[PDB]
Design a protein around this ligand. Sequence first.
Ligand code: UDP
Ligand code: CL
Ligand code: MN
Ligand code: MN
Ligand code: MN
Length: 535
Amino acid sequence: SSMSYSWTGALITPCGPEEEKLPINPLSNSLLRYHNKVYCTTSKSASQRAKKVTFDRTQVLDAHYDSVLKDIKLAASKVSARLLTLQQACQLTPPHSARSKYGFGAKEVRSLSGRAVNHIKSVWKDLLEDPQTPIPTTIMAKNEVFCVDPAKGGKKPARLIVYPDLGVRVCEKMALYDITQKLPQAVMGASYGFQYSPAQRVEYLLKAWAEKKDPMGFSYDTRHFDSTVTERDIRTEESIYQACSLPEEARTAIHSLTERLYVGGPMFNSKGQTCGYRRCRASGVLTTSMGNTITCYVKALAACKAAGIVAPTMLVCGDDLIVISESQGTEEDERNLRAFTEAMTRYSAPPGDPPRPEYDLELITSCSSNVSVALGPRGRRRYYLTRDPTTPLARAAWETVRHSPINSWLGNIIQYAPTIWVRMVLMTHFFSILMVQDTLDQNLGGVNPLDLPAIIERLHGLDAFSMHTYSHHELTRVASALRKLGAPPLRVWKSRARAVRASLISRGGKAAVCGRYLFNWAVKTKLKLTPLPEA
RNA sequence: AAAAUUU
RNA sequence: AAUUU
Ligand SMILES: O=c1ccn([C@@H]2O[C@H](COP(=O)(O)OP(=O)(O)O)[C@@H](O)[C@H]2O)c(=O)[nH]1
Ligand SMILES: [Cl-]
Ligand SMILES: [Mn+2]
Ligand SMILES: [Mn+2]
Ligand SMILES: [Mn+2]
């Protein structure tokens, strides 16, 4: 019945023009050679994304959906949730949040400038008084960097972002923020994935696996999830929110937001033209993450029940999930997963790639990552989290006038410190760069290069400095990703590391600690690395 | 654009 | 600031 979008035919315009790489990338031209493969999704491509996400939905539910939905409300009603003062909501606005059409921005909101505060009052008033007038939204293309993949057609089209004015964003927070803090955890218990560290994800997955007599695992992701969310789904989202204890004022605000913003509305391009109208999720509203996660969880747990998945243990994160079950034999497991997929398709959550049962934990990817294993210092197995390095390395080579990638290097160094690709490739390059700039002291994104050993120890354990015998998959994928981006192969990084190491060590102080801990993989006669006072 | 995690 | 959805 319902179309996800309709389109005036107006363009989707740039929200301030999007930069190009330059003829020389001085920071990353020793990391990799193939800069032609590293691109940023543009608003030109937004047209192409639109064609792909505009489609007719035909939700069809059943006793399994209905039953799960029920149970989910009996959970919701254990939650009491309060309004947020206009001022508290203002304060949660991010520092660079896109300015309001009504002549103020985030500095003002966050500083409680009085003009902003009045306007926000008036907006919230209008929410309370008017429960139907569609609220206008701006549509825009997201800019993100990837490596071209000629297998999957060259360049991905830009994702679509659709969001209301800043005044409305604050009001959303007033009504719903507290819910976002309580509801998901309440409804989903241990399945609520955003509650966990990568280390907890990893132990959760291993505990789930260990608990089964004979475990089977799989993952699912919905294609264009936001466009698959139905008017009805959203209303059902509302109905889940209202199940909690609420100020009568929240309810009205919520109901109003739901009907005027969340189920749909007109879309305007950055130049003010009418662009289209929308009858699905606007990714950009405060409820995007909580909505996606909850809704995905309803459908999935219904679909498990439809398909006979035995003793399922879920982990949900937006439209991304993993179920670890008791295998019923491969012949049946295959059948049930076809069933799972049919059910999810009937609920309007169709998959990108149809899923497949797996019986080895390394072969399950979700949220662009997976668990792997290597051997630690004493020879014991150590499971950790990793991913294809393609995108991180691509992003590591995104240098423009407005943007430096050094922060990305650090970000990935920390989050993925135990990975063979961070330790051999990013660390080496990162350190090599700063030593030469002579800016080890320098703080980046408020972190200090010379703290890393500590920071890494606090986060991944001391084993992250002694891991070896990485898996075939992991070696294969890293080798292959470096080849793809024209980077030196690992043998070369072994050399560069050893140089960086000696150079770091000669400098003494915290530098030599970094040299000694971070790069012990590089040397033939290892060292006796001991815990670090700080972590 | 929003949230979560990391810091 | 980083990453993810
Ligand atoms: O930068 C992002 C990426 C994803 N999402 C939301 O998370 C959903 C699932 O993300 P995925 O990575 O699976 O992309 P999609 O399924 O939309 O193609 C999207 O549809 C969005 O609604 C978002 O709000 N912002
Ligand atoms: Cl060990
Ligand atoms: Mn998806
Ligand atoms: Mn209502
Ligand atoms: Mn996804």
